[PDB]
Design a protein around this motif. Structure first.
Motif, PDB file in Angstrom:
ATOM      1  N   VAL A 116     -58.503 -21.091 -16.243  1.00 54.86           N
ATOM      2  CA  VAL A 116     -59.068 -21.949 -16.647  1.00 54.86           C
ATOM      3  C   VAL A 116     -58.866 -23.650 -15.698  1.00 54.86           C
ATOM      4  O   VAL A 116     -57.630 -24.129 -14.408  1.00 54.86           O
ATOM      5  N   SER A 117     -60.173 -24.166 -15.268  1.00 57.02           N
ATOM      6  CA  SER A 117     -59.790 -25.912 -14.373  1.00 57.02           C
ATOM      7  C   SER A 117     -59.541 -26.317 -15.255  1.00 57.02           C
ATOM      8  O   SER A 117     -59.637 -27.051 -16.456  1.00 57.02           O
ATOM      9  N   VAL A 151     -60.779 -28.668 -18.018  1.00 60.37           N
ATOM     10  CA  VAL A 151     -59.214 -28.977 -19.734  1.00 60.37           C
ATOM     11  C   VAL A 151     -58.434 -29.764 -19.078  1.00 60.37           C
ATOM     12  O   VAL A 151     -57.287 -29.444 -18.366  1.00 60.37           O
ATOM     13  N   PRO A 152     -58.563 -30.948 -19.362  1.00 57.94           N
ATOM     14  CA  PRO A 152     -57.399 -31.715 -18.373  1.00 57.94           C
ATOM     15  C   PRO A 152     -55.709 -31.194 -19.146  1.00 57.94           C
ATOM     16  O   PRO A 152     -55.092 -31.615 -18.456  1.00 57.94           O
ATOM     17  N   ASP A 153     -55.775 -31.365 -20.753  1.00 56.82           N
ATOM     18  CA  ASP A 153     -54.878 -31.318 -21.662  1.00 56.82           C
ATOM     19  C   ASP A 153     -53.887 -29.855 -21.105  1.00 56.82           C
ATOM     20  O   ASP A 153     -53.477 -29.782 -22.039  1.00 56.82           O
ATOM     21  N   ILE A 155     -50.194 -25.181 -22.518  1.00 60.48           N
ATOM     22  CA  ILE A 155     -50.211 -23.275 -22.352  1.00 60.48           C
ATOM     23  C   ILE A 155     -49.622 -23.505 -20.787  1.00 60.48           C
ATOM     24  O   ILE A 155     -49.855 -24.023 -20.289  1.00 60.48           O
ATOM     25  N   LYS A 156     -48.557 -23.027 -21.426  1.00 60.24           N
ATOM     26  CA  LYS A 156     -47.190 -22.940 -20.237  1.00 60.24           C
ATOM     27  C   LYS A 156     -47.379 -22.314 -19.154  1.00 60.24           C
ATOM     28  O   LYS A 156     -46.596 -22.742 -18.109  1.00 60.24           O
ATOM     29  N   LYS A 174     -54.111 -18.234 -28.640  1.00 55.47           N
ATOM     30  CA  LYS A 174     -53.621 -20.651 -28.585  1.00 55.47           C
ATOM     31  C   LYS A 174     -54.528 -21.080 -28.529  1.00 55.47           C
ATOM     32  O   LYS A 174     -54.743 -21.828 -29.352  1.00 55.47           O
ATOM     33  N   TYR A 175     -54.798 -21.133 -27.558  1.00 54.09           N
ATOM     34  CA  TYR A 175     -55.893 -22.487 -27.353  1.00 54.09           C
ATOM     35  C   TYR A 175     -57.153 -22.459 -27.728  1.00 54.09           C
ATOM     36  O   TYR A 175     -57.514 -23.718 -28.224  1.00 54.09           O
ATOM     37  N   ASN A 176     -58.330 -21.890 -28.349  1.00 50.83           N
ATOM     38  CA  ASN A 176     -59.180 -21.473 -28.170  1.00 50.83           C
ATOM     39  C   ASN A 176     -59.321 -20.889 -30.054  1.00 50.83           C
ATOM     40  O   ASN A 176     -58.118 -19.983 -30.873  1.00 50.83           O
TER      41      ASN A 176
END
Length: 121
Positions: free
Chosen positions: A38-39, A43-45, A50-51, A87-89
């Motif tokens: 993931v860039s 996706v600056p956050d 995601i650790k 988790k993210y999506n």
């Protein structure tokens, strides 16, 4: 020592089998959703969410350095790819749905890889 050589041969042959497993899993991602990290520009956050980011390219780099000592280590990284995305999506997204399909299809492959790793040793 000859013992260190023998151990290194075992690692090499594991690496061979994991390369084949990696190819088969990645074919279950024909959209290429999981191919690259993931860039953080796009996706600056992401790292707030995601650790431990993971993706197939990063796995391939580790593999080629013979960086997986056992199948468990390799499975851990595959599970991160899936779990991070789920988790993210949200559930209604193409990303989440791609991950569910990769998990389900990848299970089949991993089940036989485990047998092969135990069987050959």
């Amino acid at each position: 020592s000859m013992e260190q050589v023998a151990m290194e041969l075992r690692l090499t042959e594991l690496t061979r089998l994991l390369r084949s497993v990696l190819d088969q899993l990645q074919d279950k991602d024909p959209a290429r959703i999981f191919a690259q990290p993931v860039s953080l520009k796009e996706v600056p956050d992401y790292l707030d969410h995601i650790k431990h980011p993971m993706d197939f390219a990063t796995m391939r780099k580790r593999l080629e350095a013979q960086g997986y000592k056992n199948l468990h280590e390799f499975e851990e990284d595959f599970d991160l790819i899936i779990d991070n995305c789920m988790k993210y999506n949200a559930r209604d997204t193409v990303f989440y749905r791609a991950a569910v399909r990769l998990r389900d299809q990848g299970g089949v492959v991993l089940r036989q890889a485990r047998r092969e790793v135990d069987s050959i040793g």
